[PDB]
Subunit: 279 residues, 3 copies
């Protein structure tokens, strides 16, 4: 980053409301507002050092919770039945998530920071591991930025949940749109029973923390295909159409029967006039 | 590299013919020449910056195509039905693949290069994801070298395709031979329905782009076992017999029922007299 | 490491006895002493450069062997039937494992060292790939330290073997205990038929060789969840309770039906008084 926007230093205390609700079709979703729950749940993005107090309200008729990966939380914000941190029907509970910068410990070793592509989901609906909650749609992305991380034009969330993308019916996307040159960020999460392989036509990224190479010294494999299993999360940024131009670029699971059965979407990269060649 | 051979700078325009054909036993393969199709298809190796024009002819009675991972291609060389870039029976089409070196963008960020271990396969036989084509043998390796990359004595391709290695019958290899000290390159690709774990006796490599460490600063895990799923590709170089001597060194999938059912081969490392201890 | 303990330079010749024995319940385990076999087998830890002569005795009524990952061994210590290096019932055989430091080769390239998290297991019980042996419990961890590697307070071994952790009945752990601040090392190995995803509540590590970052330049993804398949091994160190405090922190496979069916344990992090909040 030299003219691209980059993340500032963190350290703010932030407050926020979340709700779990039952949707009309039988699914379950999180939202920042009652009546506006989505699957996947809304993106939460913070900077290393930020603290997040989430006033969580369960509007459903069964117990539910909020469990996060990667971020610092005390055992009281575990989101599990065992540690008494789930939420009764109609109830409200404040979960606290903290994040930290990396740095030297007293023993001379290097403490990793919280930065990365993470996620949150339910841990008590259906089973004490949230199997029913997760299947129904109680999951969502969390991004933690390091000071200096490159910021994108837009962020899209792709979740392989059992045999669905984002709980959608087979062969219904989702599709995403960009213009040639856009800096597009993808957050890729997997849930459920199955392993998958995420693949994008026409684009590639680094298999490291940020999905991008800092410079010529980073030996990370550059890839366009990645095996994932339940609760894996990673993310990356690509320049839409870079070196390849506009087009209807497929992304899909590359497990042959999964793509055949509907785990396919389109990354629609447009020319400025909005047209897509071959579409 | 200081006395080992290394890749030169790229930037040549290269031309090439390929064919897809039906084989007598019902399989399908690619070749550089009619009558000389193989499974896996022939290796394509280029240097970062090279352009490749492939005059592709489909000699089969069903539509077929050429789809590549990792390399730059415009949407017209997608190799998909949707983007009208497959090929009618008897037809001919010119696919263009480009590659680029890494470098700084105008925004100050670092663009990754095309270098890596990649692959090509069919995308329209049987299904619009090439399920039948891939099952029948329409796949092959592509290597893109960075300026300065270490070159091997020989390159072998190992493809785990469903429950087969290189579409072979159970317990029929393939086997590869080397002499103690040879620099051997492996390109490892997976296709089909199943996850696998690739394992080599007596040898190990780095889990990064090239499979080798540049020096003492590379923190990449050194491994001898790697989980893979459909359309994953990686590669590496080993010094045959280094620190372990000659021998019939097994490689196999480490999923227990897969090795039991025939996903096993031999890396035959010979003494100069050509003998193998214990073989 | 500056006040933390670190590994010394290696290069010692070490001797050791091992036994394979049948256990009263029908399982099979390795031990350093007859009558003290365990599943997992005892940890073997050496420094880069060490040589290890293992006088192995098979006390069982069927042929058995010792096969190691990662370490240097000549073909006579392969532990396979093919290379005549298994052991008859009642027999004794000396296996030799060597290890080496990294360094420059004559050709100018960088030879990787043996350092890493590895493992050993049987290769001839039940099948010529040790399927019965492995299922019955013939597996164990091996750690090879690089000069300067940070040493932990304690090392725990977690093995996902088919649908079990360490061959235990569903929902019986194992559990591990630590005090807030302890440097805890985990060695994580997978065996059998299935892919898994290892997950720890409240803690995270680097996806590289040592599981820790050297400093600010290491671009490795920091994770709390990792997909694994048969014969994969990795390890890492965490500071128990760092930034999160005491508590009954779950670890489990994150494949939903696996956690539901019993692949769960507890990392019990205590305050100095020995108490755990919420437990
Ligand atoms: Cl989205
Ligand atoms: Cl080959
Ligand atoms: Cl243990
Ligand atoms: Cu959990
Ligand atoms: Cu899939
Ligand atoms: Cu593709
Ligand atoms: Cu989770
Ligand atoms: Cu595709
Ligand atoms: Cu396999
Ligand atoms: Cu082995
Ligand atoms: Cu593909
Ligand atoms: Cu083996
Ligand atoms: Cu599992
Ligand atoms: Cu968790
Ligand atoms: Cu093994
Ligand atoms: Na934000
Ligand atoms: Na070439
Ligand atoms: Na020791």
């Amino acid at each position: 980053g030299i003219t691209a926007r980059t993340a500032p230093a963190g350290g703010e205390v932030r407050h926020l409301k979340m709700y779990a609700e039952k949707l009309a079709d039988g699914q379950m979703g999180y939202g920042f507002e009652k009546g506006k729950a989505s699957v996947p749940g809304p993106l939460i993005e913070v900077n290393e050092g930020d603290t997040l107090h989430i006033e969580f309200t369960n509007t459903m008729d069964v117990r539910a919770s909020l469990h996060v990966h990667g971020l610092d939380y005390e055992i009281s914000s575990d989101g599990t039945a065992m540690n008494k941190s789930d939420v009764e029907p109609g109830g409200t509970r404040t979960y606290t998530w903290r994040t930290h910068k990396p740095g030297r410990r007293d023993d001379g070793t290097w403490r990793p920071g919280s930065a990365g592509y993470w996620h949150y989901h339910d841990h008590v609906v259906g089973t004490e591991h949230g199997t029913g909650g997760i299947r129904n749609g109680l999951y969502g992305p969390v991004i933690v930025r390091r000071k200096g991380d490159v910021l994108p034009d837009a962020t899209h969330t792709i979740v392989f949940n059992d045999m669905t993308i984002n709980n959608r019916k087979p062969h219904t996307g989702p599709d995403f749109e960009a213009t040639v040159g856009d800096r597009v960020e993808i957050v890729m999460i997997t849930h459920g029973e199955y392993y998958h392989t995420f693949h994008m036509h026409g684009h590639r990224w680094a298999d490291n923390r940020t999905g991008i190479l800092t410079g010529p010294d980073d030996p990370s494999r550059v890839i366009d295909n990645k095996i994932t299993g339940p609760a894996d999360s990673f993310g990356f940024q690509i320049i839409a159409g870079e070196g390849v131009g506009a087009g209807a670029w497929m992304y899909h699971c590359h497990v042959q029967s999964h793509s055949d059965m509907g785990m396919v979407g389109l990354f629609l990269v447009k020319k400025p006039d909005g047209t897509i060649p071959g579409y």
